[PDB]
Amino acid sequence: ALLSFERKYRVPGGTLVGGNLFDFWVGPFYVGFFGVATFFFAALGIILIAWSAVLQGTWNPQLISVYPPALEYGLGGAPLAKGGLWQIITICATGAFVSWALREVEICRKLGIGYHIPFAFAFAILAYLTLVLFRPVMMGAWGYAFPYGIWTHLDWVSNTGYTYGNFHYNPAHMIAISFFFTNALALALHGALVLSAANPEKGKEMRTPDHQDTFFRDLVGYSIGTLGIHRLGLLLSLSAVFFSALCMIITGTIWFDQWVDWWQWWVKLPWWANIPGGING
């Protein structure tokens, strides 16, 4: 049940809501008021999802799919079988997510650490809210949201993309991808660096950090350092997801045409717009 050093940490307090009421654990897990909140939202949501599955007449997970209301319903409510169920399920997800974040906050307090983790998570939550709330509202129907199904959701991605041409040309999409790639690069390195120091060549002593900084200056002439790489990681990650939201929130709202075409602005600057030759002249 407890890690060899856990007991002295399991003291009362830190709860945001409800005092000592839910201030307790279940196996390794911490409950807290929000422990309960998330459970309830999670229970409800899964139920509704199964209920959608009978109306659909399949129990096969590769097939199950809960779709939003069709565009004709705009931002109004829709019949269960006709889009209501997704709308509730979406409400329930949100409930789950936010609650899961606030529990993280409550654990943070009991342990006496910073709130960076709940913090970073809120970016994930905000990306999800962008795709099922902010964008549809702004566009004008729940129908612009993505459906909850394993492959159907990949389909929405593909269809929504190809609507504006090759989505690769969405400029904030370019930026968002550069982080995803960069972050992975940096996670690759960080991990590798620490391990190689902690697990040197056979029979040698644990290298030191002073080795970590040296290994990299030797390699690329600079070492962001230990506190750095952790600040770096948090940032690349949060940024990747920040730009991911951005590229979507603008798509279909302030730009509805082909993304490639938006680049004509550059190429049509009057100082070289008419100069012959090249690719565009």
């Binding site: 890690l3 911490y30 950090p209 600079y222 948090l234 565009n280 002249g281």
Partner: protein, 302 residues
């Protein structure tokens, strides 16, 4: 508000650190560089020194040759006009030889030869730099994690412009050097193989990419959350568990039911990132050599 430790609130500087010596040929290391107070707000403020050596120079020279060989081609396309060059910079493209020449090294220069030169340059550039990551580690007596991690990346690149073009029978199947052109090639590569979303490696690869962000978000915010206990000094924490390591592990145990150790978390890390291009490489390799259309394959499984 409380301090967050995303940016330093006081900078401190001493004599330029010339680093650990070990088996390193000190003759090759450079001279310390200026210090950047700009950078000093994030990570380290000190620039340099850097280790040159034979492999560094070869790598660094081939590296520039590659880049320049592409550059002259762009200029030739731009009508040597600096205005066009700027206007059309992302439209220019150095394309592989036509399918006609196959795996031939005899394609005319304007028709694909120049692409081979550039690639040859990149090949040597990249491999030498790989050997560089390895040696730099050896000379400090360190594990070779970094070189092996690097090898994963190399895998996907090897497969894209070398192994797959060769197994298909022609260089024309490789990726063109160009900003918009390599985007198009990608988009088109999926169309031709029946939508890469049905390539289960592609799907796996995305999971590990998404995951890398998830994890580096988790790890980073955690270490910052406990840097108030010298959390960020991970080797010593490994060698002698501090409350930092404890609060870290527990926050996570109490949230989701299990947890890492300080050495442990970094194994999760190196593997989550390395699996991105590992799986990736495989998904692409089978694409068009063994499987012509992932949707059809998806219907049968064979």
């Amino acid at each position: 508000a409380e301090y967050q430790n995303i940016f330093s609130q006081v900078q401190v500087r001493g004599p330029a650190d010339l680093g650990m010596t070990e088996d390193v040929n000190l003759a090759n290391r450079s001279g310390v560089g200026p210090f950047s107070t700009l950078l000093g707000w994030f990570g380290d403020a000190q620039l340099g020194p850097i280790y040159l050596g034979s492999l560094g120079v070869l790598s660094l020279f081939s590296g520039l040759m590659w880049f320049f060989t592409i550059g002259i081609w762009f200029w030739y396309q731009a009508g040597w006009n600096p205005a066009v060059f700027l206007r059309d910079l992302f439209f220019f493209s150095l394309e592989p030889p036509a399918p006609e020449y196959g795996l031939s090294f005899a394609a005319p220069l304007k028709e694909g030869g120049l692409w081979l030169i550039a690639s040859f340059f990149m090949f040597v550039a990249v491999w030498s730099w790989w050997g560089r990551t390895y040696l730099r580690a050896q000379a400090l007596g360190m594990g070779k994690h970094t070189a092996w991690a690097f090898l994963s990346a190399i895998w996907l690149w090897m497969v894209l412009g070398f192994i797959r073009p060769i197994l298909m029978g022609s260089w024309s199947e490789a990726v063109p050097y160009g900003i918009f052109s390599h985007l198009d090639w990608t988009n088109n590569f999926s169309l031709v193989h029946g939508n890469l979303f049905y390539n289960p490696f592609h799907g796996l690869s995305i999971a590990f990419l998404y995951g890398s962000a998830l994890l580096f978000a988790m790890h980073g915010a955690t270490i910052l959350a406990v840097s108030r206990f010298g959390g960020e000094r991970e080797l010593e924490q490994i060698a002698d568990r501090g409350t930092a390591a404890e609060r870290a592990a527990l926050f996570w145990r109490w949230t989701m039911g299990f947890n890492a150790t300080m050495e442990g978390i970094h194994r999760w890390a190196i593997w989550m990132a390395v699996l991105v291009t590992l799986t990736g490489g495989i998904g692409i390799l089978l694409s068009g050599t063994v499987v012509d259309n992932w949707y059809v394959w998806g219907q049968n499984h064979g």
